[PDB]
Design a protein around this ligand. Structure first.
Ligand SMILES: NC(=O)C1=CN([C@@H]2O[C@H](COP(=O)(O)OP(=O)(O)OC[C@H]3O[C@@H](n4cnc5c(N)ncnc54)[C@H](OP(=O)(O)O)[C@@H]3O)[C@@H](O)[C@H]2O)C=CC1
Ligand SMILES: CCCCCCCCCCCCCC(=O)SCCNC(=O)CCNC(=O)[C@@H](O)C(C)(C)COP(=O)(O)O
Ligand SMILES: [Zn+2]
Lengths: 95, 134, 126, 114, 208, 340, 86
């Protein structure tokens, strides 16, 4: 979801772009501002809310010892999904 | 506008309500071109042809000790005596009390957060005031 | 004899090679390092520290790093007594100031006073 | 306060060694200007040796000026023999630094330095 | 206490205690303390006027024979009044052991050079003039050995900071590598890693 | 005023100085020392380079990380000029050729390109433009160099009214074309001179003083629209100047007068080259043009710059051109020249 | 042109401030009743030498030491400060 600032320059996923009068655009004159166009928030908004049949769900990022340490998430609020702290996955109790 | 330093941006003697003199220490330097306050006033006296007899902060605190000698002795409350003479001086000016009741300017938690020139420019204090309204 | 009698001030400000720019224009601070309130331990309030006044830290225009020009910026020295720290500051000609030790006072902790008969210091919960 | 001396008992032998060291530098400076083929004259080098000796001219402790004679003789020992180079000799002559403003108003203008 | 604890050698502990008793009663003029560390290494703590009388004993006496000066070390400790602590490390091949002769000085008091005892110190204490500022009188060629030629100050002193007071750069005005006041690209980020819980109860010092 | 262009630091190499200077022609004589004296303050300097990139490599040790931005440009193209000056808060013009080539005459170097850079600097929001003319650049002068340079100066003054136009007389340095020129006529013969070289008066100025003047003109806002004139503190005749150069270089000096009409015929003998030519009649007409004195114009003393005389730095220039038999003769082992 | 402010510094416990202390409880009130527009700033510290400061017009100041003085000496010095106006 990369967008272009009104100075003609691409915006990072942090929110970094140089303004109109800032001289430090001159380091990109004739070269390119290398940014990543696969934003983390955009690629995790696509992931579905996992319906699980337990009150307390265990997340480890997948892979066992290849992901984040395994944390336990409470799922009592039906208003709010239970978002994992590390991986951005989120769960919901199905009843 | 002559932009000065904040309170975390200058070594600075402040005194509480009980007379205990304290000094701040420089956490970060002031942003942009803003200077320490008495540096601004000393340079303004150098421009205006009325050059003050100090350069650095030690000479400022020698001057400040000349004015009142508690402001450079930190973490030491100097107890003030002589209440009865101020009481005798107070009896001369017979002033009328008003019929208006004593109302403090800070009644509830909403009036607590935004008072001075730092707390009005804070978004955290804005969230606190907005959060204690409802 | 083989021993000389020197009654002068102990002055090695010309032998340490430190320039004048950072001998007379620095305010050394001798202080018991105050306890971090996140934790309860007092092992970092046992030995005195000499720090220096923080100088200018600016944005490196290429990378946003905190560039500096203070050579004595990252110097904190550990002393055991206040007399040795004051003698070290006066031996190097460093203009100093000393903040005294702020010990925690002895409290009067009683356990039955949480469950008193006629006092305001009862607990409403536990 | 009864300590061990290094070379001098009091300031008489200390001033003697300072004086002989400056004699050595005044004898040496034309050889330094010659073999390092510096663009300075002998007069400017001797002015710099005068400035380096008057920079430390406030010491009253005999051991401190004994060690200053020792460090000056080490500088002399590395100047007579070609162990220093043109850069090591010219580092005394601060040619490349911007001149540091001394008065208060310019120090107020250019930064936060007291 | 078996798998992950280093096994204790009481034999070298007892023998270094006995040899420390031996040296402390042979030399009561300069030997000030004698301590056997918990991993069986002896430290003979002497007086700075005893560099020549003690080390000539250990080099020559038929019960010591500390033939090789292995390492010579100053340890700058700023919280003392004799802030420098010259550490001699001696290796004895015949008795197959090591001893540690520690002594003290401040800046201005010289230490008598031990090149008349161990010629190996010809450079080592030379390094202590270059790094710390401990002057050694009656040394053959005493000068700097490691730092730059026009270098002012002594590096391993703890009042001397990590980065110095001069940096170098080539300057094409004067065609010369010149020394300028240091301006770092990034400030050295100091980390306050001292955890304020008391780590070792066997090393607690008594209070005021 | 933007926050990144506020000055910081002690004014060293890794300081921030708040100068964003596009130095056109920074690969030559004045540009080398100007990027040297800007990079020791911490200026985001744009170097537009025409030549081989390798010939600009010695501008890389002159600054911190990323303070020097090298970029291509062409003299007959306002696109790259606008591309280079649109982020600079000061533009400095150091474009010059002491001889004419096939692709560019004196006019395209001194009239077309400086007016092009000044017009594009006007229409891009630049605070300060600085042009470097010559002290003898006049419309009624004998050399096409000085005439084109005065025409281009008048154009820059009428197209950018706040341009600081600076007049150096005859700069000498280690890479000059003034003292090295005067020491490279032991090859051709006996350094021939027009009318014995006694009717022309010069005062050369040292490049560190001119560079300090240019940077103190950048810093001071009292330089908007002015016209400085950088001159040396001591005036010289040409004959004893050349004799002083050959006495510092310790060379056999036997001068002889070559006449006014036959020395341009030797001037055409060297400009038949597709290389950098050794000399030409334009260099002859510029050496034999005396330095005018302009009292109504400011100089180095009106920028807080103390001028360094010739007898301190001619040894620094001329230690290269000596043989081994007097390779290390001292500075005081030569007679000073006769000022007028 | 005239006096602007008086500053009187003294200790609490030192005997050198003692007569200065004997100036204040006995005679300061009718002093302040005599000088309504003139601020007379009493400043007590713990260890200072007793002093008497007088700021005049255009920033000039005068400085009188008060070490071990009694009440009449302090009183005469203060009325000289009042009557000087220099
Ligand atoms: N003796 C002197 O040096 C004096 C000089 N001046 C003036 O100072 C200025 C600079 O002089 P100086 O440094 O000595 O000269 P240089 O020859 O050393 O440098 C001039 C620069 O201009 C560039 N340049 C010239 N013509 C063109 C062109 N057609 N297209 C693109 N770039 C071009 C060159 O680029 P490239 O590297 O690609 O060739 C070079 O970098 C000139 O205006 C000169 O008149 C004034 C007084 C004395
Ligand atoms: C080529 C350049 C190389 C430069 C080399 C620099 C060498 C620097 C050596 C420094 C050695 C010293 O600083 S020791 C001198 C300091 N001594 C003192 O302060 C003791 C007091 N000294 C004096 O009073 C001196 O003026 C005299 C000359 C000893 C006597 O003066 P008074 O008598 O009236
Ligand atoms: Zn997870």
């Amino acid at each position: 979801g990369v967008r272009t600032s009104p100075t003609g320059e691409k915006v990072t996923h942090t929110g970094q772009v140089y303004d109109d009068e800032d001289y430090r655009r001159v380091r990109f004159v004739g070269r390119q501002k290398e940014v990543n166009e696969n934003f983390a928030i955009d690629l995790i908004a696509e992931q579905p809310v996992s319906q699980v049949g337990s009150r307390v769900i265990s997340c480890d990022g997948g892979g066992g010892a290849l992901g984040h340490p395994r944390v336990y998430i409470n799922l009592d609020k039906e208003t709010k999904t239970g978002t994992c702290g590390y991986c951005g996955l989120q769960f919901r109790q199905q009843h | 506008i002559l932009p000065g330093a904040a309170y975390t941006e200058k070594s600075a003697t402040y005194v509480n309500t009980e007379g205990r003199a304290q000094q701040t220490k420089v956490a970060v330097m002031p942003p942009g071109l803003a200077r320490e306050d008495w540096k601004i006033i000393r340079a303004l006296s150098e421009i205006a042809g009325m050059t003050l007899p100090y350069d650095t902060l030690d000479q400022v605190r020698n001057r400040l000790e000349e004015v009142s000698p508690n402001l450079v002795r930190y973490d030491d409350v100097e107890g003030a005596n002589y209440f009865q003479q101020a009481s005798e001086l107070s009896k001369l000016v017979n002033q009328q009390l008003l019929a208006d009741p004593l109302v403090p300017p800070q009644l509830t938690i909403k009036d607590f957060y935004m008072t001075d020139s730092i707390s009005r420019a804070s978004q955290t204090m804005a969230k606190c005031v907005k959060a204690v309204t409802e | 004899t083989q021993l000389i009698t020197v009654d002068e001030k102990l002055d090695i400000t010309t032998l340490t090679g430190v320039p004048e720019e950072h001998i007379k224009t620095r305010k050394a601070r001798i202080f018991v390092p105050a306890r971090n309130n996140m934790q309860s331990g007092v092992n970092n309030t046992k030995k005195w520290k000499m720090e220096f006044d923080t100088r200018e830290r600016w944005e490196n225009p290429l990378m946003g790093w905190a560039s500096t020009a203070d050579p004595l910026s990252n110097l904190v020295l550990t002393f055991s007594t206040k007399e040795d720290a004051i003698a070290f500051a006066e031996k190097n000609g460093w203009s100093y100031d000393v903040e005294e030790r702020k010990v925690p006072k002895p409290k009067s902790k009683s356990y039955g006073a949480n469950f008193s008969w006629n006092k305001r210091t009862r607990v409403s919960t536990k | 306060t009864s300590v061990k001396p290094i070379f001098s008992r009091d300031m008489n032998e200390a001033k003697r060694r300072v004086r002989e060291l400056y004699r050595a530098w005044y004898r040496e400076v034309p050889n330094t200007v010659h073999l390092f083929q510096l663009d300075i004259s002998v007069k400017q080098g001797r002015d710099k040796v005068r400035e380096m000796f008057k920079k430390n001219a406030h010491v009253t402790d005999p051991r401190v000026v004994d060690l200053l004679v020792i460090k000056g003789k080490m500088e002399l020992e590395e100047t007579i023999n070609v162990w220093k180079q043109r850069t090591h000799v010219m580092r005394f002559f601060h040619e490349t630094e911007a001149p540091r403003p001394k008065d208060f108003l310019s120090k107020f203008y250019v930064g936060h330095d007291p | 206490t078996r798998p992950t604890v280093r096994p204790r050698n009481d034999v070298a502990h007892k023998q270094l205690s006995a040899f420390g008793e031996y040296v402390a009663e042979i030399l009561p003029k300069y030997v000030q303390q004698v301590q056997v560390s918990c991993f069986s290494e002896l430290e003979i703590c002497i007086h700075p006027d005893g560099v020549i009388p003690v080390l000539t004993f250990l080099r020559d006496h038929s019960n010591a024979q500390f033939k090789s000066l292995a390492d010579l070390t100053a340890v700058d400790i700023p919280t003392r009044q004799n802030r420098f602590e010259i550490v001699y490390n001696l290796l004895s091949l015949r008795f197959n052991s090591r001893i540690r002769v520690k002594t003290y000085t401040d800046e201005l008091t010289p230490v008598e050079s031990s090149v008349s005892v161990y010629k190996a110190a010809n450079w080592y204490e030379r390094e202590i003039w270059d790094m710390f500022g401990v002057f050694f009188a009656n040394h053959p060629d005493l000068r700097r050995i490691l730092t730059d030629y026009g270098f002012e100050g002594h590096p391993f002193r703890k009042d001397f900071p990590l980065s110095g007071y001069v940096e170098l750069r080539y300057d094409d005005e004067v065609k010369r590598v010149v020394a300028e006041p240091v301006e770092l690209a990034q400030e050295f980020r100091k980390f306050d890693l001292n955890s304020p819980w008391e780590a070792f109860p066997a090393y607690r010092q008594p209070p005021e | 005023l933007h926050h990144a262009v506020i000055p910081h630091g002690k004014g060293g190499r890794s300081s921030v100085s708040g100068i964003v200077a596009t130095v056109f022609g920074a690969t030559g004589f004045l540009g080398r020392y100007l990027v040297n004296h800007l990079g020791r303050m911490g200026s985001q300097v744009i170097v537009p380079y025409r030549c081989e990139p390798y010939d600009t490599m010695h501008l890389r040790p002159m600054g911190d990380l990323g303070q020097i931005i090298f970029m291509d440009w062409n003299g007959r193209d306002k696109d790259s000029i606008r591309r280079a000056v649109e982020h600079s808060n000061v533009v400095i013009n150091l474009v010059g050729r002491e001889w004419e080539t096939k692709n560019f005459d004196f006019e395209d170097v001194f009239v077309k390109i400086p007016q092009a850079i000044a017009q594009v600097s006007k229409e891009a929001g630049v605070e300060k433009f600085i042009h470097i003319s010559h002290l003898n650049a006049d419309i009624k002068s004998s050399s096409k160099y000085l005439r084109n340079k005065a025409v281009g100066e008048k154009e820059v003054r009428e197209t950018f009214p706040e341009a600081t136009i600076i007049k150096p007389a005859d700069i000498f340095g280690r890479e000059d074309r003034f003292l090295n020129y005067f020491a490279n006529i032991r090859w051709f013969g006996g350094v021939p001179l027009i009318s014995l070289g006694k009717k022309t008066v010069k005062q050369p100025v040292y490049i560190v003083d001119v560079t300090k003047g240019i940077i103190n003109a950048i810093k001071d806002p009292d330089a908007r629209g002015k016209t400085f004139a950088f001159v040396g503190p001591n005036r010289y005749l040409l004959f004893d100047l050349v004799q002083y150069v050959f006495a510092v270089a310790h060379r056999p000096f036997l001068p002889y007068p070559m006449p006014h009409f036959a020395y341009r015929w030797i001037g055409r003998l060297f400009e038949i080259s597709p290389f950098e030519p050794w000399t030409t009649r334009d260099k002859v007409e510029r050496i034999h043009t005396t330095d005018r004195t302009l009292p109504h114009l400011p100089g180095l003393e009106d920028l807080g710059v103390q001028a360094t005389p010739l007898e301190l730095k001619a040894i620094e220039v001329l230690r290269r051109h000596r043989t081994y038999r007097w390779l290390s003769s001292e500075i005081e082992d030569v007679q000073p020249a006769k000022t007028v | 042109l005239g006096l602007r402010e008086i500053r009187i510094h003294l200790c609490q416990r030192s005997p050198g401030s003692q007569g200065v202390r004997d100036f204040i409880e006995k005679r300061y009130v009718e002093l302040k009743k005599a000088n309504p527009d003139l601020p007379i700033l009493i400043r007590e510290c713990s260890d200072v030498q007793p002093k008497l400061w007088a700021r005049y017009a255009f920033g000039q100041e005068k400085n009188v030491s008060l070490n071990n003085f009694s009440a009449d000496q302090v009183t005469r010095a203060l009325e000289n400060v009042l009557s000087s106006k220099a």
